[PDB]
Amino acid sequence: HMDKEGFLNKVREAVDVVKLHIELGHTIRIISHRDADGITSAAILAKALGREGASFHISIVKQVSEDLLRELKDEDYKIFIFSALGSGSLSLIKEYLKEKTVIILDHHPPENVKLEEKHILVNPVQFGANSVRDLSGSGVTYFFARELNEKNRDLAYIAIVGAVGDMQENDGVFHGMNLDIIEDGKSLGILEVKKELRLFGRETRPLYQMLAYATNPEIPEVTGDERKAIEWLKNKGFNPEKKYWELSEEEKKKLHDFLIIHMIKHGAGKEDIDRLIGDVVISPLYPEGDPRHEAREFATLLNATGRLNLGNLGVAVCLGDEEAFRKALKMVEDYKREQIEARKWLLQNWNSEVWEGDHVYVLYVGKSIRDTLVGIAASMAINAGLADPEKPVIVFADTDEDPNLLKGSARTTERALAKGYNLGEALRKAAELVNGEGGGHAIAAGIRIPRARLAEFRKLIDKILGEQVS
C-alpha cells in the first residue's frame, strides 16, 4: 500500500530542481536504461523537456557503472537525470557526481545510503511501493513529466509500454500507480484495457506463433512447437494463420476457455492459469496489426532496438518517427528467434552445465546466449520446469564488451520470496566481495562480476542466500 500523495510531493521537489536548470538554459543530460522501461522513460523526458523548450542529450546504456560515471564527471553538463536506473548506484553517484545536480527516476530498492542536497532520489519504494508491481521507471518518469506539465498525460500509453516491458502485470493485472497512469490514459482516450490472452503477438503474429512463443507462462506441449500449435488450433476450430486481433470477441472467449481447459488437463498451476488471461493495454492511436497498437508488442519492438545497441532509434519510435519505426520493425524477428534458440539451448544443456547449490542454480552459458538475454533465459529455466522454482536461478554470460567480464541475471518465484530470499540484497552483498556490481529487486536482480571470480561467486552466493532463509 503506497503513499501516493507523499510520493507525488517528492516528484514536485525534483520538478522544482529541474525547472531551476531549465530557466537558465542548462542542457539536461539524460542517462536511461536500454530496455523498454528505459527507452520509454527517455522518450517521456524528451517530449516533456521539449514542451518546456529545454535542451537535452540522451544516452541509452546497459547499466550504471563506475566507469560510465568516471566519464560523466568530466563531461560538461550541470544537471544529470537518471531514468529507469541508478537506485543501486547511489554511493557511486554520490562519490563521483558530488559537484553536479542529479535526479534519479527509478523504482529499484534503493541503496541504503544518504544523499547530498542536490541529488534527489525519486523512488516509489521509499513510499511503500512494491518495486515490481506498483510502478516502473517509465511510470516514475511519467509522473515527473505530468507534474512538470499536465499536457504530458498524453504520454500515459508510452509509460504503460514500459511497465509491460518490465512485466509489472505479470500476475495478470496492474497494481499501484500504474492504475493511475491507466486512468489518465483512459480519460484522454489514448489507451484501453482489455481482458485478453496475455501473450506476445496480438498484432503481428499468427495465432500458432502466439501459442508456440508462450513461455510466461508456457502452454503445455505447445510451447516451442509450431506444428502442434497449428494442430491444436485447427481441432478447436481456429484458423492458425489468423492473428489474435482478427478474432471476434466471441472467438477470443472460446479460445480462452479452450486454453484454460487445456492448462487444467495438463496439470498447470493455478497461478499460471490465472495470469494467462488478464489486462492487455491497447491504443487507438495506432492501427490494428501495428505492433504499437498493443503494449507488449510495442515493448518487444523497443527491446529489439536495444538488442542491437540502437536504443536511440526506439526513443524516436516512441516520439512518432515513422522512419525509425520502419527500421525497428525489421529487428523484431531476429530478436524472437534468438529467444527460441536460447530456450532450446537451455533444454539441451541445463542438466550437464548447471551448478546446483543448496540455495541457488548457477548456469554459465559462456557466449551461447547473448548477455542481454540471460534474464529471459533465467525466467525460461523456471517456467519450463528445469529448475526447482523455490531455488533461485542465476544465468551468466560473457559481456559483449569485455570477455573477462560476466553479466548475470537472477530470477526466482513468489514462494521462494516467502522463504526469505532477496536476490537484490544477496547479489549486492556478493558483488562487494568479488569486486563487482550488483543489485535489483527481491525477485529479479542483476550482477556484473569479473570472470575469474565465478567459482568463488557460486560458493559465496549460495552461502549468502542460505543466510537469508527465515
Q: Which residues bind Cl ion (CB under 5 A)?
A: 375, 409, 446
Closest distance between Cl ion and the C-beta of residue 102, in Å? 23
C-alpha cell at 244: 489474435
Query: CA-CA distance, 5 to 306, in Å (whole number)?
Result: 34
Which of 111, 166, 184, 371 is in the footprint of Mn ion by CB under 5 A? Answer: 166
CB of 46 to Cl ion, least distance (A): 25
Q: Cα(206)–Cα(198) distance, rounded to whole angstroms? A: 15
Residues from 66 through 105 that contact Mn ion (CB under 5 A): 84
Task: Kindly tell me the burial class for residue 146, based on how many C-beta atoms sit within 10 Å of its own C-beta (0-12, 13-18, 19 or more).
Answer: buried
Q: How far is the CB of 166 from Mn ion (least distance, A)?
A: 5
CA 244/CA 293 separation, integer angstroms: 13
Closest to Cl ion by CB, 306 vs 446, is: 446
> Residue 446: which of Cl ion, Mn ion, none does it interact with, CB under 5 to 8 A by kind?
Cl ion
Q: Smallest distance, Å, CB 13 to Cl ion? A: 29
Q: Is 137 in the site for Mn ion (CB under 5 A)?
A: yes
* Phi, psi of 358, rounded to the nearest 5 degrees: -75, -20
Q: DSSP code of 355? A: E
Give the three cell numbers for residue 40: 520509454
Q: How far is the CB of 125 from Mn ion (least distance, A)?
A: 12
What is the DSSP secondary structure assignment for residue 319, as one 8-state letter?
T
Choices 113-121, 132-140, 260-268, 365-373 (CB under 5 A): range interacting with Mn ion: 132-140
Residue 216 binds which one of Cl ion, Mn ion, none, with CB within 5 to 8 A depending on kind?
Answer: none
Reference 302, options 354, 244, 372, 245; nearest CA is: 372
For Cl ion, the nearest residue by Cβ is 446
Nearer to Mn ion, 85 or 255 (CB): 85
- Which CB, 230 or 427, lies closer to Mn ion? 427
- Which stretches of 166-248 are DSSP H helices? 178-188, 207-212, 226-235
With beta carbons less than 8 A apart as the criterion, state whether 238 and 329 touch: no
- Amino acid of residue 428: R
| Residue 425 found at the interface with Mn ion (CB under 5 A) | no
For residue 240, the partner it binds in Mn ion, Cl ion, none, with Cβ less than 5 to 8 A by kind, is none
Cα 187 off chain centre by: 26
Q: Which is nearer to Cl ion, 283 or 409 (CB)?
A: 409
Residue (163 or 229) nearer to Mn ion, CB: 163
Neighbours of 367 (CB within 10 A): 11
Which residue stretch of 91-99, 115-123, 163-171, 277-285 sits at the interface with Mn ion (rule: CB under 5 A)? 163-171
In single-letter form, the type of residue at position 321 comes to D
Q: Which of residues 10-69 bind Mn ion (CB under 5 A)?
A: 37
- For residues 88 and 375, which CB has a smaller minimum distance to Cl ion in the complex? 375
User: CB under 5 to 8 A by kind: which of Mn ion, Cl ion, none does 139 bind?
Assistant: none
Among 14, 42, 29, CA closest to 77: 29
For strands 361-364 and 405-411, give the pairing.
unpaired
Taking the complex as a whole, the smallest distance from the CB of residue 375 to Cl ion amounts, in Å, to 5
Residue with the CB atom nearest Mn ion in the bound state: 37
Name the residues that contact Mn ion, by CB under 5 A. 37, 84, 137, 166
